[model samples]
Target: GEWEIIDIGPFTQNLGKFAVDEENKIGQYGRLTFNKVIRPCMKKTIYEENGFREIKGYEYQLYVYASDKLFRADISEDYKTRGRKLLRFNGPVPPP
Candidate 1:
């Protein structure tokens, strides 16, 4: 399969980490697998851009480039993490 970004936080006790897909979405942290044995179901993200930016309070943010539309994916962190992955905006694209 192609490289699909997954929101696997809830699948792994909210210790959210992004991972690419193979047969399915594979998420891991440290040595722990976010897999339920053979079931590693996860959510797909709408980001064609691969890199992200980390702001002080914002944590991780992605610039979503879609059909001439620019979006700010203000994904917050808590050492635990927080926030949505997309916010509608109209401007030049932000760098990674």
Candidate 2:
């Protein structure tokens, strides 16, 4: 478990930026459900490869962009703020 494949690369756009935190959007050949955001101790997760899915309350899954790409990411479990570190950056180049 030491870097076999980790490429969280390529995103068509902030892609609706998760509709600002609500309404999901997906327009490809069919089904749509994609959002990858899990930050807590970060035990190692770079897109759960090979068709991921574990939905149970605004969940997680990936893959399904047939070119008409529009993948966006961000939804860190809403468990009433999962422990400390809550955004605080002004510099260090933090813009798209």
Candidate 3:
């Protein structure tokens, strides 16, 4: 499919709204819950002699309630382990 950005946060951006079925259970325990979702696509560009080549890749969108922010991580084509293949975000964790 074409490249697209998916919003995985429980709350909507700017308008400050939450999904109809979304629930923050951690709040009941005086804790925070971070919701997330994953989307896959074939838009990554691998290096080539001409310059680069577009290839399919997986990505995950993260929402941290404690921080009230969104984050994402891209899995690399260079990922070599079986464990890495099972994960969507194999790269280093993004800085909060």
Candidate 4:
């Protein structure tokens, strides 16, 4: 719930910015269900997700912030349609 400077990047002025919470990362919407039908569940993230670039096909090269390593994640075939309401990071975290 606090800002940690992504100082590893070129931008270095102050280690000051309110660190974004995963609330937005998990689609942060869909609430006040009439009877829980419209309620949403929070998707969990494992790796300290860093910046990323889209790969050529069905994949993405994600820079994990935990170890600053680039790893892969998949783009679903149906991404253009519906239900991006859930996603999980199956990528590995760094080994101690």
| lDDT (tens digit, per residue) of candidate 3 on 1-96 | 234544433422311122101223223323333443333222233333353453334322332233343333233333233122212322223444
Worst 10 residues of 1 by lDDT: 15-24
TM-score of each: 0.23, 0.18, 0.24, 0.19
Better candidate by lDDT, 1 or 2 = 1
Per-residue lDDT over 1-96 for candidate 4, one digit per residue giving the tens place of the 0 to 100 score:
111213223211110010111212443332211111111111222232354532221211122222232222222212334222212333333322
TM-score attained by model 3: 0.24
In angstroms, give how far residue 61 of model 1 lies from its true place: 2.1
Q: Give the TM-score of candidate 4.
A: 0.19
- Candidate number that wins on TM-score, 2 or 4: 4
> Runs in model 2 with CA error above 4 Å?
1-21, 24-67, 80-96
Go through the candidates in order and give each one's C-alpha lDDT. Answer: 0.30, 0.27, 0.30, 0.22
**Candidate 1 residue runs with Cα over 4 Å from true position:** 1-58, 81-96
Model 4 pairs in collision:
3-19
Can you write out model 1's per-residue Cα lDDT over 1-96, one digit (the tens) per residue? 122344424443232223111101222212222221111223333332444632223233333333343333333333224433322222334433
